# Entry
Amino acid sequence: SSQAWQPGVAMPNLYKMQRMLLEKCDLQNYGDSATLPKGIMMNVAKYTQLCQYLNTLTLAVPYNMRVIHFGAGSDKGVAPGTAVLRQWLPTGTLLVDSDLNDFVSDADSTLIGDCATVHTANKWDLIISDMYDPKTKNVTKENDSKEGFFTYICGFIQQKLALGGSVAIKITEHSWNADLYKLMGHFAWWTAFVTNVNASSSEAFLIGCNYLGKPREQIDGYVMHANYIFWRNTNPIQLSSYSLFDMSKFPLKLRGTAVMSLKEGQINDMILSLLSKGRLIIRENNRVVISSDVLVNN
Amino acid sequence: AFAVDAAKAYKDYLASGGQPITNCVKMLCTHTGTGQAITVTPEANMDQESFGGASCCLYCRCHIDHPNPKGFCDLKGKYVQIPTTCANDPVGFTLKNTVCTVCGMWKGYGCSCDQ
Ligand SMILES: Nc1ncnc2c1ncn2[C@@H]1O[C@H](CSCc2cc(C(=O)O)cc(-c3ccc(O)cc3)c2)[C@@H](O)[C@H]1O
Ligand SMILES: [Zn+2]
Ligand SMILES: [Zn+2]
# Structure
């Protein structure tokens, strides 16, 4: 583990190519903890390592970058992950966050309620989700693909992610969805990323890098989650907070990526290639308008 | 003429020996920053910790209205630097102290315009 000095560990490509069957996840280092810097909370450390890993990918970073963050409230009413995302993102990036429960936030704008009540007019450059329902982690029954908020997330990616944009969506052994894995094949590249501070847990972020709006690759989502569990089961990851102590190169690079508005007939292989290298965003550049549905009754 | 005075209510509860507001969001940073009080990214120096602003605002945290006509919050969406010796009560600190308008440091913990 030269891995201990990385922000985390990504699913190696050879594990993606397997055809494993789903097993129960049994982590060697389950119940260990990393020692966090004094007074630093798990969700700050976790989002910091996630952003540090995203720094190594070909993220498109336009002027007027637009980021939306789902599942951003804590049980203490604040938004630690949102605070890390604002630190990471270029000054002036529009950041909207949301959560079922009320919380106060550093985001430019916040919507409270089930994520299915959230509507936006515009498309987004980067979607981050931390949503998780702890009722799913019941070990006593079959681990099938889950719907709930994952159904919203897949719809939201297909309808509201700009071409070239990227996603990072939290999953676990039991909190996962087969269509979301299938959608990873609609990006130029994908992985499952485990932060070193939370390596004792089956959580990972499914990261889709540079959205292409069409299948580049055909992915069976039940097989790929089985492959992810197999990787985790046979590759213990040493807990580590090492990367948190060097923040000198943390901010996301201002790449000034080009934004163009194109009808879908104009997406040729040359556009696709620019999307694939993080050099192009395709969406409009109008005002960002969002809203929340309110049900009225007595 | 009635207005609820939450700033005074929190200072009074600190005075009687009450536990400060917790779970202010402390950031990872280099601790080689300018040291100014309220900034767009963490700017803590060797003697400071950096916190996400909204989590350090009394009015945000207590879900009450901000005391000015505009209604605006000048911490939300920013980062506030707290002296490490005061970081047990970031809300109390920001409420009780004042930012220098010329150099941007805290009056009394970094402002050097007065000698
Ligand atoms: N449909 C939705 N729409 C909008 N937001 C949603 C939706 N679904 C979930 N969220 C939000 O996601 C955010 C992250 S869950 C983090 C988490 C992790 C763990 C763990 O593994 O240790 C345990 C619990 C937990 C334990 C006991 C409880 O009683 C409640 C939670 C919670 C929360 O703030 C949720 O509100
Ligand atoms: Zn406030
Ligand atoms: Zn001064």
